[PDB]
Symmetry: C2
Subunit: 94 residues, 2 copies
């Protein structure tokens, strides 16, 4: 599985592409509801380039998938921050 | 798809199955701690969650997704508020 350093920040230049809506946060999982050309290892972020993390699992029906991003323990602070931002548009870095 | 008048009768065997962890977009997510296709989930007071719609997650610690229909919005809102409670499987 793949993991993201802490000082990794999405540069303000890079292209960001809308992908879905942050819908859920439990147990260090972040759930995004699909709304868009995705990879293994694609990185999700919010519009302000707050980095969410890397795709862990795709589930739900093919038409409107749900994406699950599992954060590691070291990323608890980030989890709590996202927990509180449910409903914001999520994006996939390219 | 369950009828309206359907409630779990207090007489029926219930079985712990996981913990209610999440509710969004009419889905209820349960974290596992036998199950059949078409098994009914409920809480310990027999409050009906609904019928299994999807098994995902890793094989060791699955998650269960129950999609409720629009007509059961009131029940979603009630379950939304009850996160963390033990879930059970009817038998």
């Amino acid at each position: 599985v793949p993991e993201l350093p802490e000082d990794y920040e999405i540069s303000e230049k890079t292209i960001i592409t809308p992908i879905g809506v942050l819908k859920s946060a439990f147990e260090n999982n972040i759930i995004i509801h699909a709304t868009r050309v995705l990879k293994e290892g694609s990185i999700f972020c919010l519009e302000d380039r707050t980095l969410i993390g890397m795709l862990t699992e795709v589930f739900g029906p093919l038409q409107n998938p749900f994406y699950r991003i599992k954060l590691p323990d070291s990323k608890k602070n980030l989890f709590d921050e996202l927990k509180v931002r449910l409903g914001e548009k999520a994006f996939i870095v390219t």
